[PDB]
């Protein structure tokens, strides 16, 4: 018929190639599930999946293991898509991994790794980037290659438990460039003993908490 190619789709990107140029929530197979994910369709070419996103403060990224593993919020909002989900993903080809980030004053900033995958879970979701290019600065670099840290599950570089005290899920090392999962606040200044905040060290720093975090991935096409 006349009507165009649907889903669900391997990835964002193929959904984009196949004419659908506005963002939103579609559907993805990933390993041998459906799944919604918000497809960024316009930014930088378009074909972008939503792995990560925060916004408002509406879901708990303080949460469990399990939680982290399988994915946790909703696509139309906040939500982690899953470390599980993001290895089958990136277990198969090369990734792009596009970091978005806008702070109180509106101002926008850009974080590339031309390379991005995660082990399995045998292996703690240890972090693999690739070269670094963008207007952000490169906040995630000192978190490559390393395991995947929750409260209960301390595998960092750091004396104490890093996720006690900066409340996400992550990568931690002694602890951090930037803390995507950490506590949302209501503005980019804070009251707390620790930053704690959705921060990125080179782009309005650890002591601040940035109004929109996301986090994005695409096939990587040399
Ligand atoms: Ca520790």
Redesign the pocket.
């Known amino acids: 018929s006349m009507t165009k190619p649907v889903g669900p789709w391997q990835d964002c990107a193929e959904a984009r190639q196949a004419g659908h140029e506005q963002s939103g929530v579609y559907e993805l197979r990933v390993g041998r599930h459906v799944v919604s994910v918000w497809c960024e369709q316009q930014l930088e070419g378009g074909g972008w999946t939503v792995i990560q996103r925060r916004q408002d403060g509406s879901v708990n990224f303080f949460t469990t293991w399990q939680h982290y593993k399988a994915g946790f919020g909703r696509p139309d909002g906040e939500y982690w898509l899953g470390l599980e989900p993001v290895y089958q993903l990136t277990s198969r080809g090369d990734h792009e991994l596009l970091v978005l980030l806008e702070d109180w004053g509106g101002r926008g900033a850009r974080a590339h790794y031309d390379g991005f995958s995660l082990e399995p879970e045998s292996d703690h979701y240890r972090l693999r980037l690739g070269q670094y290019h963008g207007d952000a600065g490169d906040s995630l670099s000192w978190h490559n290659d390393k395991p995947f840290?929750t409260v209960d599950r301390?595998?960092?570089?750091?004396?104490?438990?890093?996720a006690l005290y900066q409340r996400g899920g992550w990568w931690?090392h002694?602890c951090a460039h930037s803390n995507l999962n950490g506590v949302w606040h209501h503005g980019g200044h804070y009251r707390s003993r620790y930053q704690d905040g959705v921060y990125w060290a080179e782009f309005r720093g650890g002591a601040y908490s940035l109004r929109k975090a996301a986090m994005l991935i695409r096939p990587l096409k040399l």
């Not at 301390?154 to 890093?162: A, F, I, P, V």
């Open positions: 840290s301390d595998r960092d570089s750091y004396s104490g438990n890093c931690y002694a």
